[PDB]
Amino acid sequence: RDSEEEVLRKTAHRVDLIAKYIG
Amino acid sequence: EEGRLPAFSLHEVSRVLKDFLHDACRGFYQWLPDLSRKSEDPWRDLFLWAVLQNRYEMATYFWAMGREGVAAALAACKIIKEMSHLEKEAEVARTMREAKYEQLALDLFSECYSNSEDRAFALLVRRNHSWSRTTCLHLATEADAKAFFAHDGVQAFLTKIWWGDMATILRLLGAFTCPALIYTNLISFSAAFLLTRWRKFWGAPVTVFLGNVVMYFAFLFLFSYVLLVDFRPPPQGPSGSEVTLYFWVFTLVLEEIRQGFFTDTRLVKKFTLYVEDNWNKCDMVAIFLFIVGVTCRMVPSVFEAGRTVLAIDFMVFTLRLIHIFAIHKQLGPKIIIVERMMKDVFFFLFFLSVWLVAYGVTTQALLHLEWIFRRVLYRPYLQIFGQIPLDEIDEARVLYANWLVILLLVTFLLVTNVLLMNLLIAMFSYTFQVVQGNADMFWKFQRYHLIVEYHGRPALAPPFILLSHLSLVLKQVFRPDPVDQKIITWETVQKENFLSTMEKRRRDSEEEVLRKTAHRVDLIAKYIG
Amino acid sequence: LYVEDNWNKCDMVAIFLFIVGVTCRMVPSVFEAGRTVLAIDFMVFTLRLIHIFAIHKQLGPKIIIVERMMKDVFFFLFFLSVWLVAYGVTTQALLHLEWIFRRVLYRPYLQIFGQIPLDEIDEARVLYANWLVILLLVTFLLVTNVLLMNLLIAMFSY
Amino acid sequence: AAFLLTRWRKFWGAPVTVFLGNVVMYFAFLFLFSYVLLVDFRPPPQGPSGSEVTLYFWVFTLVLEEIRQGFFTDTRLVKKFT
Numbered sequence: 111r112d113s114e115e116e117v118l119r120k121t122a123h124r125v126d127l128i129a130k131y132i133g
Numbered sequence: 134e135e136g137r138l139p140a141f142s143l144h145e146v147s148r149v150l151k152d153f154l155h156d157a158c159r160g161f162y163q164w165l166p167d168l169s170r171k172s173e174d175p176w177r178d179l180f181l182w183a184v185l186q187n188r189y190e191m192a193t194y195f196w197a198m199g200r201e202g203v204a205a206a207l208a209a210c211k212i213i214k215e216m217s218h219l220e221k222e223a224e225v226a227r228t229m230r231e232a233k234y235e236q237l238a239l240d241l242f243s244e245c246y247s248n249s250e251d252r253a254f255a256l257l258v259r260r261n262h263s264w265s266r267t268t269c270l271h272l273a274t275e276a277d278a279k280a281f282f283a284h285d286g287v288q289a290f291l292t293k294i295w296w297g298d299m300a301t302i303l304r305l306l307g308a309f310t311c312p313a314l315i316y317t318n319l320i321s322f323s324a325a326f327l328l329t330r331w332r333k334f335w336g337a338p339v340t341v342f343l344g345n346v347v348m349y350f351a352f353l354f355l356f357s358y359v360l361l362v363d364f365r366p367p368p369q370g371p372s373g374s375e376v377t378l379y380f381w382v383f384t385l386v387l388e389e390i391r392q393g394f395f396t397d398t399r400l401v402k403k404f405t406l407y408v409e410d411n412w413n414k415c416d417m418v419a420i421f422l423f424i425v426g427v428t429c430r431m432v433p434s435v436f437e438a439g440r441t442v443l444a445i446d447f448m449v450f451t452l453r454l455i456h457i458f459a460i461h462k463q464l465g466p467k468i469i470i471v472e473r474m475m476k477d478v479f480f481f482l483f484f485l486s487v488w489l490v491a492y493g494v495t496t497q498a499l500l501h502l503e504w505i506f507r508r509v510l511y512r513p514y515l516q517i518f519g520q521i522p523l524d525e526i527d528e529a530r531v532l533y534a535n536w537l538v539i540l541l542l543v544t545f546l547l548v549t550n551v552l553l554m555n556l557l558i559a560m561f562s563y564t565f566q567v568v569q570g571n572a573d574m575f576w577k578f579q580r581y582h583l584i585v586e587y588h589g590r591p592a593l594a595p596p597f598i599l600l601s602h603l604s605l606v607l608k609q610v611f612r613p614d615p616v617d618q619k620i621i622t623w624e625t626v627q628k629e630n631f632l633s634t635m636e637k638r639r640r641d642s643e644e645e646v647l648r649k650t651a652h653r654v655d656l657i658a659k660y661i662g
Numbered sequence: 663l664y665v666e667d668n669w670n671k672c673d674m675v676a677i678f679l680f681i682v683g684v685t686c687r688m689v690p691s692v693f694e695a696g697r698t699v700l701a702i703d704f705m706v707f708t709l710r711l712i713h714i715f716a717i718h719k720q721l722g723p724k725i726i727i728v729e730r731m732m733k734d735v736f737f738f739l740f741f742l743s744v745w746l747v748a749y750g751v752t753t754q755a756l757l758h759l760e761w762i763f764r765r766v767l768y769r770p771y772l773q774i775f776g777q778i779p780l781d782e783i784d785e786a787r788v789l790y791a792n793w794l795v796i797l798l799l800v801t802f803l804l805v806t807n808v809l810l811m812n813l814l815i816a817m818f819s820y
Numbered sequence: 821a822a823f824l825l826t827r828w829r830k831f832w833g834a835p836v837t838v839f840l841g842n843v844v845m846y847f848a849f850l851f852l853f854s855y856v857l858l859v860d861f862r863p864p865p866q867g868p869s870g871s872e873v874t875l876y877f878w879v880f881t882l883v884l885e886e887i888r889q890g891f892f893t894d895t896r897l898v899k900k901f902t
């Protein structure tokens with residue numbers, strides 16, 4: 111679960127979501 | 134309960150304590166004192182508790198708000214090792230063995246020594262009332278964790294001892310040749326002026342050490358000469374040079390007894406520390422061989438056999454003299470690795486001997502118990518030469534054995550030369566790579582020991598060494614705090630800075646950045662929707 | 663700057679040896695000794711000529727490394743000489759200063775060959791020394807051959 | 821009294837124990853056979869066969885021991901021999 115690459119992927123998803131929802 | 138002859142109390146606690154760290158904690162808690170009374174060294178007992186209790190972080194924080202650190206930590210690692218073989222639970226045993234406190238202490242010393250190198254050395258030498266007015270050096274000794282010596286400052290203080298008060302090569306050797314204090318007035322230094330300067334030029338460890346190698350070398354040569362032609366029949370003249378050598382040998386024996394007997398709590402412990410050294414064991418067996426051969430003059434009928442005994446003892450002492458060359462910077466680790474591989478090659482050569490025996494047996498009787506036995510033995514001996522005198526076999530063929538002799542010969546050469554050799558370079562590389570630092574430790578270690586011994590060796594020559602021991606026996610029969618605290622505070626501040634630094638480093642850890650960023654971004658995502 | 667170069671130092675000592683031997687023709691009584699001096703100088707110049715081969719691309723670093731290890735092997739061979747002296751001393755007198763000395767020296771020389779002429783020892787046994795001779799011989803071969811050699815490959819890799 | 825019998829069973833049942841015993845026995849028989857090949861490999865007088873037969877009979881016993889160790893460890897005799 112705590113795999114660093116998994117962290118990268120989850121963070122990428124969350125940031126793309128934040129960017130899209132912001133505009 | 135054994136002392137009886139919960140139940141335990143501070144009495145048995147102090148008992149067990151003084152049992153482990155013998156000289157460090159002789160007499161704490163002077164059979165019980167007023168339990169209501171407050172402490173003297175509270176944090177001391179705290180860290181002790183946590184150690185006994187195996188509370189790593191606890192003892193950590195205790196050490197934090199404590200004084201006289203490095204020594205404390207040394208004792209800590211010592212007792213951690215103590216409570217390793219005395220553990221029942223295997224996993225708990227490994228956990229206990231996972232102390233790593235030596236690393237902490239080394240960090241402390243590296244830190245403090247990164248400044249005020251002189252004051253740092255002083256700290257390394259300062260007495261320790263907290264640990265019963267003792268020497269951190271001795272602490273590490275009782276700890277026997279060689280890495281304690283691994284720090285550069287260790288070699289620094291050792292060297293500052295080693296090159297004498299005139300610390301400042303072949304120039305120093307030529308100086309050692311002739312007493313030219315004026316040359317010393319040009320080489321290096323650091324009416325009574327000449328007397329004190331001579332004391333300065335003689336008190337150096339390397340000085341007396343070169344003197345000792347000179348004396349030992351000369352006595353080896355002289356004894357070799359005596360064994361050459363002075364090992365004569367029991368006429369008195371023959372005994373003349375013989376007795377001259379033997380009396381001085383006994384003097385050397387007395388010097389060894391002095392160096393090994395008056396360095397101690399228990400005479401048993403003293404003799405144990407003595408028998409610890411392998412080289413002292415070599416000395417003891419050498420004198421055993423010499424005293425055994427000393428029966429030669431007693432029995433002129435057995436004079437030649439006793440002479441052979443003395444020859445063996447000669448070989449012993451000759452091998453012993455070789456011990457010194459390891460003192461060299463570059464040669465040191467070489468001799469160390471050499472000592473390391475001593476065990477395996479023995480068994481390897483045993484196997485080689487078995488194989489050679491097999492070969493010679495298979496060859497001799499199949500070819501053709503004194504006359505026919507001596508020839509067979511000679512053939513076996515000539516195996517190393519490789520003469521291979523199969524002329525007789527060829528004559529016999531002129532047959533069914535020459536082919537098998539060649540086959541077995543070839544395969545024997547193959548197996549021995551290839552394996553018994555190339556196998557050794559593997560262990561050579563293994564002893565090289567990391568066991569080179571290990572043997573650097575070993576070398577620095579024996580180096581410490583030799584430095585102490587030379588310092589421990591009286592500033593005297595072998596001739597008057599008898600006079601020095603006589604003076605010692607006659608003397609026997611005839612019968613600061615502000616600076617300390619200042620340097621203590623220095624160490625405390627050093628520790629504080631070190632810890633702050635370590636945690637500052639831990640803060641900016643990239644993985645910590647990942648975690649904090651992940652938390653912040655999940656928070657932003659959740660709060661956004 | 664001149665005396666800086668080691669090879670210029672070799673040149674200087676070579677000419678020193680040549681000029682020293684130049685006294686041979688001056689003293690025909692000492693003509694042969696001066697000739698031996700010239701022979702030494704010859705050896706010097708011969709070694710000197712070898713300096714050039716390092717100029718090669720591939721051979722260069724080889725000769726360089728060779729020059730590097732020059733110091734340690736000297737002391738190693740000194741230790742080996744000490745050990746050989748010990749062995750020969752322990753053997754000769756225990757077995758049996760000119761006639762008996764020359765033979766002992768020859769035995770020491772034959773050590774490299776490994777002839778191991780223990781015939782006299784065997785005759786004596788026909789004894790308490792052959793076993794110790796074999797033990798010390800074996801351990802000497804072991805220590806020298808193994809250590810004094812494999813120690814060098816470490817410095818070679820370094 | 822049976823204490824010593826059981827303790828002897830304990831000191832003898834160990835693998836390393838019998839193993840050292842075996843190396844001892846094999847070593848000794850190697851030495852003895854080497855001796856027999858040295859001088860007991862004699863003409864066909866009976867005495868010569870004496871030590872010779874003493875060695876050879878025990879060799880056959882060793883053979884039987886090997887057969888035992890390799891034959892009674894099996895589903896198929898073919899699989900056993902394999």
Ligand SMILES: [Ca+2]
Pocket residue numbers: 389412413416
């Ligand atoms: Ca000693």
Ligand SMILES: [Ca+2]
Pocket residue numbers: 669670673
């Ligand atoms: Ca030149």
